[PDB]
Amino acid sequence: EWTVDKIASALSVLAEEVPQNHSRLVNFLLEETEKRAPQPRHLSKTDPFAHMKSKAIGVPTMDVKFKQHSGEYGKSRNSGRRFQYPVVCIKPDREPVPIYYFHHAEIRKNILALNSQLNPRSQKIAKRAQAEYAATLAPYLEPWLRKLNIEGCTKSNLIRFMASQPESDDSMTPQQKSNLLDTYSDDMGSPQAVRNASMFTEAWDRVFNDQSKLRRVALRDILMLDKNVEPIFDNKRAKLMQKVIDALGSYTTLGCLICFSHDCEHGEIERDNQKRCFSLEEIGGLMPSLRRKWAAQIEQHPPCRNECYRIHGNQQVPPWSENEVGTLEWMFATIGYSQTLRPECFVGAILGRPCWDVHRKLQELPPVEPTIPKQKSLPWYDRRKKQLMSDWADATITHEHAVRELFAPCHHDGPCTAANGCPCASAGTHPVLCERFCLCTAEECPLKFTGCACHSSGKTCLQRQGRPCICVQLNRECDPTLCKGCGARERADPENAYDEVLHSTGQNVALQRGAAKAVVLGKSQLEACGYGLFAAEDIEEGEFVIEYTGELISHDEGVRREHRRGFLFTLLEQEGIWVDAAIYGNLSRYINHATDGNIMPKIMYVNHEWRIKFTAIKDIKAGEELFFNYGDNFPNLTRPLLVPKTTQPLFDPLSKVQLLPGQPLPQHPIDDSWLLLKHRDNLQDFIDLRPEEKEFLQEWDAFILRRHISSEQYLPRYFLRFVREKADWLVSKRSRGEEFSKLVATLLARRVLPERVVIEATQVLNDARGRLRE
Amino acid sequence: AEWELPRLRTSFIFQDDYKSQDLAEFFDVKFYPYSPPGAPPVFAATSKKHAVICRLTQTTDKDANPCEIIQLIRDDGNEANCASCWSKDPITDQPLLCIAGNEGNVKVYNVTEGKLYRTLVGHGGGINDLATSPANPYIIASASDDTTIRIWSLAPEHEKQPCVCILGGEGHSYDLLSVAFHDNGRYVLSAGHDQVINLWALPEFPNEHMEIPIVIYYPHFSSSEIHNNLVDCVAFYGDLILSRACHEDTIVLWRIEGFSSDDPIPGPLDAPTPTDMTKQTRSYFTPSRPAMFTRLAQFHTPDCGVQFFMRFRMYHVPGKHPILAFANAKSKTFFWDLARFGEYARFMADLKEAQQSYNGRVVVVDQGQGISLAQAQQVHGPGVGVVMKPAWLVPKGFSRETLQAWADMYDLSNPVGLIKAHRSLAIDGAFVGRQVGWSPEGEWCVVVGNGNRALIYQRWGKERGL
Ligand SMILES: CC[C@H](C)n1cc(C)c2c(C(=O)NCc3c(C)cc(C)[nH]c3=O)cc(-c3ccc(N4CCNCC4)nc3)cc21
Ligand SMILES: [Zn+2]
Ligand SMILES: [Zn+2]
Ligand SMILES: [Zn+2]
Ligand SMILES: [Zn+2]
Ligand SMILES: [Zn+2]
Ligand SMILES: [Zn+2]
Ligand SMILES: [Zn+2]
Ligand SMILES: [Zn+2]
């Protein structure tokens, strides 16, 4: 039977093995390192200096005074001798490149930055000391408990004691003391077991948390490192119909509406680097999107080669796991009331089961209400003629990106009016049009954007045409899906970027095409500037030159960064987003300022991204340097392609080697591996996700991110390439196909995957398994 | 003889060459590491404008000068220099000296014939440190104000584009001061004004032209927590780390949890990325939640004050004792012999064993005499305990002040302790030390610092009878 003092006595005796083991370990590692001392390598066979005698003496000449020393004192022997020496002068054959800070890496598209810490000093120092000691002592707590063997003095019971103590208020949280006492519970056992745990805790803090010191740690500090306590204090969490909803919640929470990845550059970062994905959850989760898919369905081929239910539909088939009933439920809900596609075939290939089997477990949906309250058209925008009229530049702020705040696209149930809380009509100073991701249909809603109306066998969708181009008026590029006359479907596809004959016809998609003009880093013609950007090919006035890409950051991160560094481009002034190209960007970060520029930036809306495009305002000959007038864009928040002949030295962007007039211009493919790795690890860091979802999420994300999709026009093609290149991999493990099956499920729920590709993937997966059957 | 520490033998002062009348400094010294074993050792001392190259020859005369200056090179450009390293011509095997400074270019000098071998261009700011790889003498690493490390190759296949690798990304965010190679030549440490120490894993480099250098975005270990100030010097000691920061007056011996140079070299996609912006340490190597590094020992280095860019050097050689050397900012040169720690702990063990195995009747006897444990046992027979005490343990049974003196120099039981220098040699006049360098066979130790002064220390001399 113990006291706090007899316990503090025994912890004192047990604690003196800590320095002993330390000395043992340091001595061991020192002895080990000495033994494996490295032999000096690459010795020459001969003393290369052997032939050289002292050089002491119109040659440049320099002095050296030598002193000699002896005795333990180091006292001299005299004032010392002086000698003069000839000096060999060697000039260098090359100039340094212009000044720069950081390695400048290229990125194809803007990336979303996290907020960084700005790194009282004494509290920082003291916490580090305490942390280092907590790690020293943690390995000892359980061997010592074992050795003392005081009833109720177990690691778990000391964790329970801590959670019940008055410091559970300043340290802990709703759900923090909840799920602590979920894994552990409250009961500490006998009345004497609770007394022991509390006397122990106090003896520990008396022995090791001596407030006189810097090397000091509370028991609480050590218990917090426990692998079962630590997850409770880690804020990296990703989160009949309620069956499906919960099955797809990973995909409806993480999957991006713009680019279809689950870790991408879209969405919002909060002050604590919690991220709201731009996902189905920002527009109401699964249900509003799905109840609408059905409502469109009610208001309206060949067999699978896996023993089609269409022909068969005995016994002798294995029992069904609940994992694989769910798999058929959620493919049944999100295919819904289809005519051209049924679950059985596709479930049949997701699970290794015959198509007739899933039909006799299937054979063995909430009602959908049909209303269209007819709204009067706004006088400033006809969506059927796709045209704006009269005072339109005053009624809306759809084109004034600087004044616009971002909102979740509307997902209400009625008309898009202030009365129903529609953000589009009413959140801003004025109405903005509803976009691709709003659940209205430009059929219900007069505010819906319908694309432009241009068609021309020549060039169209130009900066000024008889009827203007509504997309150009709204300062946006054309939508590959809405703008069906201009050729946007083919010209915004990056696979046609260098089809020069395609792009000589049909002109407002330069950012999505992704082809910049040929340009080249060099030393700027301007005194007091370092680097500049030089055109490498002739650019005609009006042509798009390049995009300003970089890290997207918020106002306060921008401030933190201007401090930390002792050039932050404004993208959205009122929302407070800036593009920072100090490290990540492209060659447009090197364009210099001139009041009389030859290019000009414009903020463009591009399929629910905002982006900075540079356009020529004069003819620019190859070799000319590019300037634009900075203006307010940079606030203080606090025919082979050839190196042109130019007066100024030019550089490879990476090697900083100097380019020679007329050799081939270096076009280096963009290195994105380091960027995939960050996104792979951001998914891995979620505590909310099982290993089997992580594995598939990370495999899809690695594929789809390299494609930078901005538009659902191109998803079905890349979705097909994924199932082809990965079908061998998807039928290997049963976890993988079921995860696949949820992705497909939530893409169907958004009507974003045509079912002509779902029946096609059913083929590739049945085939893939037929070749696995070896 | 093996226990001998150095003593001052020669000092010289090189004429002021950054004139404003006496602020000139020697910033680097390095002995040539590629001479056949036993050749007379040669070293280069780098001032702001000159490379002083001197041969050291042991003497029998206490008053002879062992030092002969065989070559003297001036950088005729506008640069001020502060970093050097050695390499070799890949075709001829002649010594090359690499010199680097504030214009951002590495000059490579053919020093036996007073010509420029070539220039390495590409850094966007001043270079503060150079290091040759122990595994390949044609591979040099440079640490720059521009935040990056560049890896250069003098091998013939890379003459048209010699930067084979840039260590960039967001590992460092201010000027780097220190770069160091592991012995295997694939692990590189970097440190600077941002207080971050980084460990990078270099790829194998193709033995053919590279139009661009490999770029590495993520170090495999990274921490700003080992020090609380700017880090100005870093080095491997085998697999262990030695490092130093301004205002701390220590050299920290520490290790990375789970790092062994006997495991396979991780690739670049094994690196840890910064998914958590509040974590100040991340590591690929981590084997309840453990430390990612652990402090081992702290060599006490008093009176550096606010001076930074002061560098230490360990002598680490098969079959000789490891010696850490460092000169502070008040004119003192400190030495530690790392093999005294084991012999002291071994001595204190035999002492405490025998003070219980004989109830205190223990006579302690010096080694380094003609007297064995066997001869000394004969003098009192099996009645008494005889324990052999290292000759270099000098008193200040044993006194309390003697035990505290010995514990201060040799006890490795406190990772936040301060291990006193084993020898502490005073320097005449005001002297801030910048760099230390050892001869191949370790009989010479050269310390260069301000006033363009070099202090030359010897041990194992041949002097006799003035
Ligand atoms: C961290 C410090 C500060 C915030 N910072 C950040 C960066 C990216 C950067 C750079 C740099 O990466 N530039 C390349 C470059 C770009 C990116 C764009 C254009 C149009 N043009 C360019 O060159 C350079 C300098 C700097 C300092 C002193 C200096 N002088 C001093 C006395 N006179 C001689 C030289 N010159 C340049 C600072 C930088
Ligand atoms: Zn996205
Ligand atoms: Zn079928
Ligand atoms: Zn609405
Ligand atoms: Zn809307
Ligand atoms: Zn609407
Ligand atoms: Zn148009
Ligand atoms: Zn359009
Ligand atoms: Zn168009």
Author numbering:
A (entry chain B): 196 to 252, 261 to 322, 360 to 479, 492 to 552, 567 to 579, 584 to 634, 639 to 644, 646 to 740, ...
B (entry chain A): 7 to 25, 34 to 301, 307 to 415, 489 to 558
Text from the published report:
Based on our structural analysis, we introduced several “humanizing” mutations (hm) into the SET and SAL domains of ctEzh2. Specifically, hmEzh2 contains a SAL domain with P302I and R304Y mutations to mimic the human counterpart (top alignment). Notably, this region is poorly conserved with the corresponding aligned region of human Ezh2 that directly mediates drug binding and contains one of the gating residues, Y661 (bottom alignment). This region was mutated to resemble residues of the human Ezh2, under the assumption that this may result in a tighter drug-binding pocket. We next sought to solve the crystal structure of hmPRC2 bound to GSK126 to determine whether the humanizing mutations actually resulted in a tighter drug-binding pocket on the molecular level. The co-crystal structure of GSK126-bound hmPRC2 was solved at 2.65 Å resolution. Despite a lower overall resolution compared to the wiltype structure, the hmPRC2 structure exhibits an improved electron density map for GSK126 that enclosed the entirety of the drug compared to the wild-type complex (compare hmPRC2 on left to ctPRC2 on right). The body and tail of the inhibitor in hmPRC2 are shifted to a location that is akin to the human PRC2-GSK126 structure. The P302I and R304Y mutations more closely approach the drug and apparently provide improved stability for the pyridine-piperazine tail of GSK126 (and detailed in Fig. S5B). However, it should be noted that additional electron density was apparent for the sec-butyl arm of GSK126 in the hmPRC2 structure that was missing in the ctPRC2 version. hmPRC2 contained replacements of residues 849–855 of the SET domain with human residues in attempts to impose an improvement of drug binding. However, electron density is largely missing for this region in the hmPRC2 structure, implying that it did not fold in the same manner as the bona fide human version, at least in the current format (compared to Fig. S5B).
